[PDB]
Amino acid sequence: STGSATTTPIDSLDDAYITPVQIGTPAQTLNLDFDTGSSDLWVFSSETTASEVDGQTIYTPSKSTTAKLLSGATWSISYGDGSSSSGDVYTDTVSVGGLTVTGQAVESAKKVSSSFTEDSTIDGLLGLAFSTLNTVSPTQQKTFFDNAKASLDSPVFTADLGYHAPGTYNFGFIDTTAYTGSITYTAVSTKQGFWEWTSTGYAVGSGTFKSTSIDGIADTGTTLLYLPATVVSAYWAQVSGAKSSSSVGGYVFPCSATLPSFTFGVGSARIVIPGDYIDFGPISTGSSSCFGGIQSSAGIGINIFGDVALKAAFVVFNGATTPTLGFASK
Ligand SMILES: N=C(N)SCc1ccc(CSC(=N)N)cc1
Ligand SMILES: N=C(N)SCc1ccc(CSC(=N)N)cc1
Numbered sequence: 060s061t062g063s064a065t066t067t068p069i070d071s072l073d074d075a076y077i078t079p080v081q082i083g084t085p086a087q088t089l090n091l092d093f094d095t096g097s098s099d100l101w102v103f104s105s106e107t108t109a110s111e112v113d114g115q116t117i118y119t120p121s122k123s124t125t126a127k128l129l130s131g132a133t134w135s136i137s138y139g140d141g142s143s144s145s146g147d148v149y150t151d152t153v154s155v156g157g158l159t160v161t162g163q164a165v166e167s168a169k170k171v172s173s174s175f176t177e178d179s180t181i182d183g184l185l186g187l188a189f190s191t192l193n194t195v196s197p198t199q200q201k202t203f204f205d206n207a208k209a210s211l212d213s214p215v216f217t218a219d220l221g222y223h224a225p226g227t228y229n230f231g232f233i234d235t236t237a238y239t240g241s242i243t244y245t246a247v248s249t250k251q252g253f254w255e256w257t258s259t260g261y262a263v264g265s266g267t268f269k270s271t272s273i274d275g276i277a278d279t280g281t282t283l284l285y286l287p288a289t290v291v292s293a294y295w296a297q298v299s300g301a302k303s304s305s306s307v308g309g310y311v312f313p314c315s316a317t318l319p320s321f322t323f324g325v326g327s328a329r330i331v332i333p334g335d336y337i338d339f340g341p342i343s344t345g346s347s348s349c350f351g352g353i354q355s356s357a358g359i360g361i362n363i364f365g366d367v368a369l370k371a372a373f374v375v376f377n378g379a380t381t382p383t384l385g386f387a388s389k
Contacts, residue, residue: 077182
């Protein structure tokens, strides 16, 4: 089997991407944030504290004839931005782009933090990291991908995120029309539960490539590209007037600037992030200071190849017995 679903930016800045997901019988369609940096499928629901729901579509398990309460199971998770959510667990039928899993753990939120409430466009998360990170207790649950894998034509999924445009998540096949050139595969460590890999270096604009190992994670659930301070300083030094702002929380730059590209290495291959992809727009409405899309990972404890990087590529998440990642230009 295979599945194929379109993923759409939530706003004009590509702050996150949502993908429609069918849950239950009859189907209830929710728009979820597919997150290769976590491993829980959780949804706003009829159980969510009423004051914490503001415009999201909810899952109502009592209206699904295939929903079953997973007795005694609870979950609780935190995200890189300090947001969090928690609740109880059902199993139900979940379909993505025509691919169906029965018995998928659907984590129903009883509580969500304010940043989830305030974002009406995201109805929950669909985790695609390794199932060892799943938070359900006392019996850990498998991700949608893990549950689907045995049925898939090939044990892979692919991320093809758009820049200010829709893109695609495919399960079970590699669309050879969706990329240029070849896919370069690279080793993954699963020891932290992430799609963790080592980039072979970087270049800024038309500058020379610096060969240096950069360990980090392929994370569709993080918006920006977080890299070591040395790398990020080298990038922003090429932008007149750019500075690191302690009060804003990162590098900012004049909105009048034209940004240079940023290249990262995948083995001997090179993925080029166009400069425009690094512009995250005014720091506050009406400002002429703009927020940068490449930020320091110092203090986060890991480098993160988030959407800024991934959207410049066609990315294969190969979930064979020894997982690997693939990257192609597009
Ligand atoms: N694990 C560590 N000690 S590094 C801290 C860290 C790890 C992962 C993320 C992204 S989580 C996500 N995409 N839901 C953010 C921060
Ligand atoms: N806690 C605060 N000082 S402001 C909290 C807050 C953030 C964002 C908005 C606009 S998005 C919306 N209304 N859903 C409204 C309130």
